[PDB]
Amino acid sequence: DCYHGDGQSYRGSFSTTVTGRTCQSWSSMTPHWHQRTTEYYPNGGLTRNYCRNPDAEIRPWCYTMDPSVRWEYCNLTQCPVMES
Amino acid sequence: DCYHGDGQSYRGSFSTTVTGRTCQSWSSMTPHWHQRTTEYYPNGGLTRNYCRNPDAEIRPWCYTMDPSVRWEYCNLTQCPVMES
Numbered sequence: 001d002c003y004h005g006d007g008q009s010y011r012g013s014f015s016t017t018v019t020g021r022t023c024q025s026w027s028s029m030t031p032h033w034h035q036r037t038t039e040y041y042p043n044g045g046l047t048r049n050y051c052r053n054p055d056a057e058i059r060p061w062c063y064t065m066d067p068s069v070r071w072e073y074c075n076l077t078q079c080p081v082m083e084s
Numbered sequence: 085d086c087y088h089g090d091g092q093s094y095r096g097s098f099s100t101t102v103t104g105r106t107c108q109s110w111s112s113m114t115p116h117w118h119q120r121t122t123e124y125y126p127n128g129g130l131t132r133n134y135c136r137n138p139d140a141e142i143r144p145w146c147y148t149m150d151p152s153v154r155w156e157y158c159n160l161t162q163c164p165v166m167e168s
């Protein structure tokens with residue numbers, strides 16, 4: 001599993017962070033209150049707790065289930081790019 | 085005590101909400117995490133837990149100490165305006 005571009009188009013089910021924390025569901029406000037929901041970002045693919053990039057960070061990310069860690073980049077790398 | 089204009093200029097010590105809740109200190113991330121701190125909004129007068137309006141809401145406001153109520157308008161009204 002990997003993302004293309006900056007990962008705005010990523011639509012897989014990867015849901016864990018670079019430090020092995022569990023992503024929080026986008027629809028949930030717990031533990032972290034936020035405004036990155038599917039209503040606010042309808043083009044973001046914000047479903048379940050899957051890594052996404054609705055607001056054009058540099059790569060896919062999520063809020064985390066650790067109350068002390070608001071959000072992290074997900075443990076995904078960019079897919080091999082087209083080479084000449 | 086009262087505010088002028090939309091209350092961006094309010095610099096008094098009123099610190100309670102329209103429902104009688106206590107304002108959270110601007111520098112604190114508890115109970116509510118936020119980005120309305122004096123470093124982000126240096127022109128906002130964000131000190132202690134006093135009602136302010138750093139981001140041009142319609143009137144002064146604060147985050148609250150009730151974990152279930154993120155922010156409210158403060159219990160302040162507009163000062164009597166200049167009449168012709």
Ligand SMILES: O=C(Nc1cccc(C[C@H](C(=O)O)[C@H]2CCNC2)c1)Nc1cccc(C[C@H](C(=O)O)[C@H]2CCNC2)c1
Binds near residue numbers: 035118139155
């Ligand atoms: O938040 C933002 N703009 C905002 C606009 C209108 C209302 C509000 C809501 C304000 C509150 O409840 O704090 C109210 C209070 C009264 N006045 C407005 C916030 N923008 C924002 C910009 C950059 C970064 C972030 C943090 C964001 C996050 O950590 O959630 C990250 C996550 C990964 N990508 C970004 C947020």
Ligand SMILES: [Mg+2]
Binds near residue numbers: 077078
């Ligand atoms: Mg790479």
Ligand SMILES: [Mg+2]
Binds near residue numbers: 161
């Ligand atoms: Mg009035």
